[PDB]
């Protein structure tokens, strides 16, 4: 679970 597209 990442905090947005910018990973």
């Amino acid at each position, epitope marked *: *679970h*990442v*905090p*947005g*597209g*910018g*990973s």
Partner: antibody
Amino acid sequence: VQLQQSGPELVKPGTSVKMPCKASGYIFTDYVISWVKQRTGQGLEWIGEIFPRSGSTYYNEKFKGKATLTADKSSNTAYMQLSSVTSEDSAVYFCARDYYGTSFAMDYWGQGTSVTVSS
Amino acid sequence: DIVMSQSPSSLAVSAGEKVTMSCKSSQSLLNSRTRKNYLAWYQQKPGQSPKLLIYWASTRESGVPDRFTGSGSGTDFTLTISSVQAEDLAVYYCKQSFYLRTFGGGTKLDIKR
């Protein structure tokens, strides 16, 4: 695909409210549920998100310690709980399905639970 | 901790006219994830729940008509409606999803007849 929220709720100052968002028409564990606030005549305001596969959450700084985002894989239901509520929390609250992984966009929204905080 | 700014706050046009509105981010919305800017546009008609119109800065969501066209890159983005209809009466918000999420404060569309 559908997201079904509870009906309008009156709650007392200082107390809690927990509202559900019952999901259907898709794989519950393949998407995130995000939650959005909207005060009478105001803009939209993001509260946070929950990834049901893992239970993990994110929060707008604003809503840390106020809003507790939970979920239930077995019944495909996400919940948001507000604690120690005030007149500030009186608003319409949406749940929305966020296509985490690509769009990162909220393609489907619930009908919104209208919460009024007053005694 | 990213902020979104929309302008103009309000807009009015006659049915058939073209309209344009602007959304600016305090930082870049682009990534290593393909050309992708993580920016979306949402429509809210009075009494109704929001509707996703555009994601990835430019891509039409399914069931959104083609007269809605989003554009821009990095920190500057635009929604254009050609041939505005009476039914386009709404508030349009822009949203960042590059980090966490942040909505714009909306551009209200009024119709002149």
